Every structure is written in C-alpha cells, then in structure tokens.
Amino acid sequence: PTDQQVSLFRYITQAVVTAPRAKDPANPSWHEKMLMYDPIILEDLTAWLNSGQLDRVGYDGEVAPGDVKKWCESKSVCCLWR
Amino acid sequence: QCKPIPALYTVYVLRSTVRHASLYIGSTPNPPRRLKQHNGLVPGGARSSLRPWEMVALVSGFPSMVAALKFQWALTNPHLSRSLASVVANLHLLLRVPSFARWPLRVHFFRRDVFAAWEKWCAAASERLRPSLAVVTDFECWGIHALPLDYEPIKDYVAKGQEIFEFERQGACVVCREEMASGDGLQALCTNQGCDGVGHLSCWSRHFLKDSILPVQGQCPKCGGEMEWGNMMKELTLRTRGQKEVEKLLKR
Ligand SMILES: [Zn+2]
Ligand SMILES: [Zn+2]
C-alpha cells in the first residue's frame, strides 16, 4: 500500500519462499507453516527475517514487526502478536 | 501451531426473535451447543429479554481458532476496518479484504430474510466475490444442526493417507518427480478418491500458483481432479499433528 513497503514486500516474500524446506515434518519452515494456515507469531518471524535471511536475498538493513504484519495481511497469512 | 486444522470453526451472526434489530456476532466450533448456551439451556453463555436467539447466518472453514477470532473482531468493529444491512455489507467487504481473501471460507445463510439482504447487497456490489467462495443456503435436521461437527466428512480421505504413508507407497512427487523418502519433509496427498498422488508440500503451492503465498483452488497433475487447498491441509495437519484425532475417527 505505501510506496516504500512495496519494495520491502518483494524481499520478505523472497526470503520466506527461498528458505530451505524442512527435512523433519515436525519442524516446518516458515513458508511451509504459512502454507498450512498456521498462526504466525510476528516476533518469531520478524526475528527470523533479521537473522540474516534478508541479507541473503539482498536487503541490507532491518525490518519492523509492523511492516511484517502488513506483509502477512497482504498475502492472507494469519498472524498474531505474542 | 501444534494442533491440526479444526474440523469446524465458524463465525456466526446471532439475532433475537423478540427484537429483529438486535444482532450479535461471535464464534464457536460447535454452533448447536453455543446456541443452546445463548438460550440458557446449556451453561456457558454471556439477558433473557431477547431470548430465544437464532443463527441467521455463519461463515465456516476457518483453518485455525486464531483466524476465526481475527475475523470475528473484524466484523464486530467495522469502524476500525449494528443492523442487518450493515452486517451483510461489512461481511461482504471483509471477504474481499486481502487479510481474509484467500482463506478456505464458506458462507451459510439460514433465514430467507437475511439471505435476501445478502443478494440485495451483492446486486449493488462494487467488486464481485471470488467464485471459489461458496455461498449456500439452508432454510426450513436442518440449518446449523446439519453442519458436521467432526472429521467424518473426510474419513475415507484420512484412511487413504493412513495407508499410503504407513506403508511407504508415497512414491515419487507428482510435480518435481523426484523420489521422496519416508518422513522426508512435509508430503501432501491429493484428495480425490482412487488417486494416490503425493508431492512435497512446497511443490503443490508452486504448482497451484502459476506474487502469492497461499493457494486457493487447483487441479491435480496425476488424476486431473480439482482440489481446494484448505482440505489438503486439513488432512496433512491431521496426519502430522493429530495422531489421537485420527484414531478416534477410524475407531483405531
Ligand atoms: Zn517435490
Ligand atoms: Zn489426484
């Protein structure tokens, strides 16, 4: 919606969907968790996004949880605060 | 999440029969019991003056309780996003809002008056509602007492996976074609009976979406049938997490 988020959203999408799929079905990846309609704790996802997963897909800097929540809602991903 | 996709979770519009103008918006996985509580027959409800209440309509298929509550609050508060006219119109917009547009939802109406307002509003609607969003009616067991509260409507589907994955008949993925080992990642099974096509979970999503993260509708590569992403996940999560829930279903 905002002119600056639209760039950040393309990266957040990338980092989530390019992360390696899980080899253990009990501990799925973040992309797989959204696929199965899991409620997504924003603190956990935002922290994972700042672990180095955004530097991998070419976004230097840091993301705020509110920006991540707006990402989830644009993709119909169920999310919630902790 | 640690529990499988609930067998049923609804967001309902409750109306008084004493006063047709009094509406109430809650949620429950068991509409008959919650209606019994709203009418004092079962302990647990929130004012007899307006009893007995009725469920004129409800939205079903919320893949998690969290999701159903995110929706319930969003409809009790349209000023941050009263009457049957506004409830019907707010419901129509929320179903197009991106935060809920791709959820495995079904809209149920139970009163010809309330369903009439829905059609009156859809006739003037700005955007058309997504055709995958089933809007069904059920007037005058009927109504809410027809909705299946358990996992029975997918009993055979669940039994199919219990065979394919217990005996390692999973075969090779039907998208990437690479041979999948047993318990090697999340492997999602097709829904249509007679077919045993299995694939890696992220491969189906890649396939259904040919921009987006969450699939909605799609066709099977092996058998050519059509599936809704909600059902395929309701079985995957049932198999991954709900081992106890599966046993009670098949009497095992
Ligand atoms: Zn695959
Ligand atoms: Zn098939």
Give a three-class secondary structure readout of B92-143: HHHCCCCCCCCCCCEEEECCHHHHHHHHHHHHCCCCCCCCCCEEEECCCCCH
Write the DSSP assignment of B176-216 as a string of letters: S-PBPPTTSS-EEE--STT---EEEHHHHHHHH----SS--
Report how far ligand 1's centroid is from the alpha carbon of B2 (Å): 24
C-alpha neighbours within 13 Å on the C-beta side of residue A74: 17
* Sign, CA torsion B144/B93/A70/B205: positive
* Closest ligand to residue B157's CA: 2
CA distances for B62 relative to A43, B29, B32, B97, B241, angstroms:
23, 9, 17, 15, 18
Contact B90, B25 (CB under 8 A): no
Contact A52, A12 (CB under 8 A): no
Residue B187: closest CA among B175, B174, B199: B199
Query: Of B62, B200, B202, B209, which to mutate for an interface test with A (greatest number of A Cβ within 10 Å)?
Result: B202
Count helices and strands in chain A by DSSP H and E runs: 5, 2
**Per residue in B139-155, is it b (16+ CB within 10 Å) or e — as a string?**
eeeebbeebeeebeebe
Query: Binding-site residues of B, please?
Result: 139, 173, 176, 190, 195, 200, 203, 220, 223
For residue A40, how far is the Cα from the chain centroid? 9
Q: Cα(first)–Cα(last) distance of chain A, in Å? A: 25
* Sign, CA torsion B130/A65/A46/B3: negative
Residues B221 and B203: their CA atoms lie apart, in Å, by: 12
CA distances for A26 relative to B21, B66, B186, B233, angstroms:
48, 20, 8, 14
Please give the helix or strand (H or E) that residue B218 lies within, else none: strand B217-219
Residues B217 and B239: their CA atoms lie apart, in Å, by: 21
User: Which residue, chain included where needed, has tokens 């395929």?
Assistant: B232
**Those residues with Cβ within 8 angstroms of residue A1's Cβ, 6 or more apart along the chain or in another chain:** A70, A74
Dihedral-angle region of residue A61 (phi above 0 means left; psi in -120 to 50 means alpha; beta otherwise): left
Identity (one letter) of the amino acid at A37? Y
Please give the helix or strand (H or E) that residue B166 lies within, else none: helix B155-166
Interface of A with B (CB under 8 A): 13, 16-17, 21-26, 28-29, 31-39, 73-78, 80
